[PDB]
Amino acid sequence: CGSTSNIKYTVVKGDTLTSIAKKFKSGICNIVSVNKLANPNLIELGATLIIPENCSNPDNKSCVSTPAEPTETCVPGLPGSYTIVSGDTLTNISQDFNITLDSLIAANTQIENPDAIDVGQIITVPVCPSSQCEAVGTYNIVAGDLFVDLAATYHTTIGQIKALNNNVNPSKLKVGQQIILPQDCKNVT
Amino acid sequence: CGSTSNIKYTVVKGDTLTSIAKKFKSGICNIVSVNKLANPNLIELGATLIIPENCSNPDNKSCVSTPAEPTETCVPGLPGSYTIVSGDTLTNISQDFNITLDSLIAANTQIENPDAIDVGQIITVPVCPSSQCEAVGTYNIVAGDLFVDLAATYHTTIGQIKALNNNVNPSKLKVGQQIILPQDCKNVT
Ligand SMILES: CC(=O)N[C@@H]1[C@@H](O)[C@H](O[C@@H]2O[C@H](CO)[C@@H](O[C@@H]3O[C@H](CO)[C@@H](O[C@@H]4O[C@H](CO)[C@@H](O)[C@H](O)[C@H]4NC(C)=O)[C@H](O)[C@H]3NC(C)=O)[C@H](O)[C@H]2NC(C)=O)[C@@H](CO)O[C@@H]1O
Ligand SMILES: CC(=O)N[C@@H]1[C@@H](O)[C@H](O[C@@H]2O[C@H](CO)[C@@H](O[C@@H]3O[C@H](CO)[C@@H](O[C@@H]4O[C@H](CO)[C@@H](O)[C@H](O)[C@H]4NC(C)=O)[C@H](O)[C@H]3NC(C)=O)[C@H](O)[C@H]2NC(C)=O)[C@@H](CO)O[C@@H]1O
Ligand SMILES: *[C@@H]1O[C@H](CO)[C@@H](O[C@@H]2O[C@H](CO)[C@@H](O)[C@H](O)[C@H]2NC(C)=O)[C@H](O)[C@H]1NC(C)=O
Ligand SMILES: *[C@@H]1O[C@H](CO)[C@@H](O[C@@H]2O[C@H](CO)[C@@H](O)[C@H](O)[C@H]2NC(C)=O)[C@H](O)[C@H]1NC(C)=O
Ligand SMILES: *[C@@H]1O[C@H](CO)[C@@H](O)[C@H](O)[C@H]1NC(C)=O
Ligand SMILES: *[C@@H]1O[C@H](CO)[C@@H](O)[C@H](O)[C@H]1NC(C)=O
């Protein structure tokens, strides 16, 4: 990393390796390597990490697949709606659904100002015509499970998992917890 | 019906043939018969119906399958949560999910008083362990479609359709409207 110092750092609410790497001018993959993290997406609240700070040569690419900006304008299969929770923004919710912000705003012409939404407000999610998810049902959380990773494994999205578990905080999942998991969401015909 | 008079009546918000029959001391099936209604569950806002009033011999049974009080304590497959809309009560939401009121309250110990819920509040829906719906996706509304009837045809519940379309008023469905429809919800294994 060619860091100028190492700090031991305590992981707090809202942290990701991306946010940590940016705060300390480090690299995602250097933090992974130095701490022997099995999964760059998983860091536990209250854990200590060694962070190489102010790196001349940060690596943010080798260990992670950085997904591009969403380009789709609809979500396959479900849901028709999503309920706003504390901290949500239309930007982040569109990202979670892998759709453009523009498409989500367009689906919600009842919203007067897209930056003024309220906890408990229901928004429409634009669903692709002729689309479905194949088998939506119970799943028990195992150690290290994350919505981001389940979405990839099961061919869905973070947003779709959130909508089906809309009062579940993704950062507070417990081993054995039952969630509802959609699978294999796609256009058909 | 052995009515003592007939009134022409205009269907308004919240009406069902059950509520009309009770207001006018008529019978569901007599109103069906006299008005040549194809589907006892379907009466259109603003329609006129002939109602035989104050019947000595009301028929509320021959044309309808009156379902009993729910006895199940969980819903198969989905959803993890439901968002309260105007007019909702935990009694009616449990009925829509075909579960006991008791089970829904038990799933929601965060609610201090079950009679004081707010529009926009998110409640947990108790989902049966080891259960799924088979193919959740888009459906276009055709003339005369109702959530009550789609639930029966597709082996789901009114509540599950509502949760997947939580800002859709079931009384305001339009021909061609895309909704999200779960199917074949059951325990598995
Ligand atoms: C490389 C990069 O920046 N990737 C990000 C990616 O990290 C984002 O995903 C979010 O990551 C955070 C951090 O890992 C997730 O929060 C963690 O969630 C898990 C599960 O709830 C928590 O684990 C629990 O931890 C406690 C101890 O604290 C243990 O007792 C529990 O057993 C344990 N549970 C399990 C099942 O193992 C962990 O504490 C949380 N950490 C923090 C800092 O909150 C968050 O869930 C995750 N978000 C989603 C939606 O999956 C991702 C966000 O989109 O972007 C990148 O891909
Ligand atoms: C026997 C008995 O009491 N059964 C009840 C059952 O009626 C309950 O179900 C509710 O029924 C009401 C009344 O039929 C449903 O509301 C109607 O909904 C339809 C669809 O949205 C409306 O149709 C539209 O009408 C306008 C004109 O007004 C037309 O322009 C549209 O084309 C037309 N749309 C379609 C697709 O045809 C109709 O106006 C509504 N009527 C009223 C009075 O609101 C209501 O949706 C339905 N509820 C559900 C959840 O399905 C049922 C409730 O659980 O209990 C019994 O089984
Ligand atoms: C978000 O959507 C994009 C666009 O559909 C997805 O990227 C495409 O995935 C398909 C299916 O495997 C590939 O054929 C394309 O080549 C992918 N890239 C692009 C630029 O279109 C991407 O998978 C989705 N991201 C997430 C996180 O779900
Ligand atoms: C509500 O739940 C009850 C109980 O599961 C359902 O009634 C049963 O349906 C099964 C499956 O066909 C039958 O084998 C039972 O005989 C039924 N009756 C009883 C008393 O258990 C009923 O189908 C559900 N109602 C709705 C509207 O979904
Ligand atoms: C699914 O179909 C919709 C509707 O035509 C289209 O907009 C969308 O891009 C399709 N999705 C994919 C991944 O091809
Ligand atoms: C589904 O399984 C659950 C969990 O055991 C049980 O409570 C429920 O009654 C089952 N449903 C049916 C319809 O048999």
Residue numbers in the entry:
A (entry chain A), B (entry chain A): 7 to 195
Please share excerpts from the published article on this structure.
The leaf mold fungus Cladosporium fulvum abundantly secretes the LysM-containing effector protein Ecp6 during colonization of its host tomato. Ecp6 acts as a scavenger of chitin fragments and thus prevents recognition of the fungus by host immune receptors. The three LysMs of Ecp6 (LysM1–LysM3) share the typical βααβ-fold, with LysM1 being separated by a long and flexible linker from a compact and rigid body formed by LysM2 and LysM3. The composite LysM1–LysM3 binding site shows ultra-high chitin-binding affinity, thus explaining how LysM effectors outcompete plant host receptors for chitin binding.
Here, we report the crystal structure of Ecp6 to a resolution of 1.6 Å, revealing a novel mechanism for chitin binding by LysMs that developed in fungi, involving substrate-induced intrachain dimerization of two LysM domains to form a buried intramolecular chitin-binding groove. The structure was determined by single-wavelength anomalous dispersion (SAD) and refined to a resolution of 1.6 Å with an Rwork and Rfree of 20.3% and 22.5%, respectively. The structure model comprises nearly the complete mature protein sequence, from amino acid residues 7 to 195. Unexpectedly, the calculated 2Fo−Fc map showed a well-defined electron density for a bound chitin tetramer (GlcNAc)4 in a large interdomain groove between LysM1 and LysM3 (∼16 Å long and ∼11 Å across its widest points), although the protein crystallized in the absence of exogenously added chitin. Specifically, the groove is shaped by the amino acids 20GDTLT24 and 46PNLIEL51 of LysM1 and 150GDLFV154 and 176PSKL179 of LysM3. Furthermore, the solute-exposed ends of the chitin tetramer in the structure suggest that longer oligomers can also be bound to the groove, in which case four GlcNAc units of a chitin oligomer make direct contact with the protein while the remaining parts of the molecule protrude into the solvent.
